[PDB]
Amino acid sequence: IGIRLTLPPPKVVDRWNEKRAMFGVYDNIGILGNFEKHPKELIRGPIWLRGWKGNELQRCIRKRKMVGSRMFADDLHNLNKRIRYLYKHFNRHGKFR
Amino acid sequence: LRNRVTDRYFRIQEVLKHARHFRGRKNRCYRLAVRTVIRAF
């Protein structure tokens, strides 16, 4: 029987943390900071998708170009395979073609 | 697994409460129960 007997330890949360209290701050820097910076410089993540949306395939492509040369062989290979697959899936297999 | 089901037992019960009084597996085994229950309905 999958369901469990003892109800979990109560997940206490501080909504007034240093993160959540100052969430969204500066985000909106340009429109009232004479456009020194863009809010796409605020976003901190992977170097390839840093102010750039994308698809799955597109993302993969981006990764391959911007990082590829400094990727782990095995991982690179996997990425390549994915790209190969993804292209096939998009450009051929599907509905509405 | 992101988001998988926790409230499954309840769903099963929701069918099985009607099969309670049948003969055989039908009253226990959900797969069989459901078919019987629907027919009854």
């Binding site: 369901i3 469990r4 003892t6 | 998988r4 926790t6 409230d7 037992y9």
Partner: peptide, 26 residues
């Protein structure tokens, strides 16, 4: 160990109900 809480709560309630049905108070 699944991620929820509501389901667990419901189950607890059910259990309680069952208990009540079984060995009720005076």
């Amino acid at each position: 160990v699944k991620k929820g809480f509501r389901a667990a709560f419901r189950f607890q309630k059910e259990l309680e109900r069952q208990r009540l049905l079984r060995c009720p108070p005076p």
